[PDB]
Amino acid sequence: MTEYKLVVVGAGGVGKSALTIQLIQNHFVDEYDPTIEDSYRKQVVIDGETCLLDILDTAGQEEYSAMRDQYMRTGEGFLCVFAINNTKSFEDIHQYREQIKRVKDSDDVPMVLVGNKCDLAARTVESRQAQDLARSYGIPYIETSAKTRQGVEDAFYTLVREIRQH
C-alpha cells in the first residue's frame, strides 16, 4: 500500500486539528488542547487504489521542540490551513512559505493553501486577494470547514494528486 505524508501547518485557531480528527472520528472537536503531539492516519481509497496518509498536526511541546523542522523535510503534502474568518492566519501563511522553502531549500514543494472556516457569511478575507497569494507560488486555493465536512475532501484530495505528479 502506498503511503504519503501530510505536513499540516497553519495557526492555533484555523481548524487544522478539527479537520484531521473529523476525517477520522468525525465528531468536530470543540475543545482540543493544542498542547498535544501525535500522528493521525487513515486508510481510505482515492479512486480505486488505497493509500495510508500519515497526517501530522504538529502542535508544540514547550520551547526547544526541534521536531517540526525535521518534519518539513520528511512529509511533502503541505496543507497550510488558513482561516479566512481570522485574518491573522493569512499573515501566518506569508512567513510559513519561507520555512518550508528553507527545509527543502528548493522552492518546489507540493504546496496547498486551504481556506478553513468558510461555513459562514462573515468573510474578513475576500476570495480574490487570496487567489493572488496562492497563484503567486503556483499552488491551488481551497476553502474547507471542520464544522460540517465541507471542503475537507477537496483539500486532502488535491494534496494526494499534486504529490502523485510532483
Ligand X SMILES: Nc1nc2c(ncn2[C@@H]2O[C@H](COP(=O)(O)OP(=O)(O)O)[C@@H](O)[C@H]2O)c(=O)[nH]1
Amino acid in the structure at residue 95: Q
- Alpha carbons 158 and 123: distance in angstroms, whole number: 23
Place of cell 488535491: 158
Largest CA distance in the chain: 43
Alpha-carbon distance values, 83 to 11, 16, 149 (Å) = 8, 9, 15
Radius of gyration for the chain, computed over Cα atoms and rounded to the nearest angstrom: 15
With CB under 5 A as the contact rule, the residue among 17, 89, 116, 145 that binds Mg ion is: 17
76: DSSP letter:
-
With CB under 6 A as the contact rule, the residue among 34, 35, 44, 107 that binds ligand X is: 34
CB of 101 to ligand X, least distance (A): 22
45: DSSP letter:
B
Residue of closest CB approach to ligand X: 15
Using rule CB under 6 A, residue 97 touches ligand X: no
Using rule CB under 6 A, residue 140 touches ligand X: no
Binding partner at 13 among Mg ion, ligand X, none, C-beta below 5 to 8 Å by kind: ligand X
Find the part of the chain contacting ligand X (CB under 6 A) among 6-14, 38-46, 133-141, 158-166: 6-14
Size (the chain), residues? 166
**Site residues (vs Mg ion, CB under 5 A):** 17, 34
Query: From the annotation, which residues make up the binding site?
Result: 13-18, 29-35, 59-60, 116-119, 145-147
**Site residues (vs ligand X, CB under 6 A):** 11-18, 30, 32, 34, 116-117, 119, 145-147
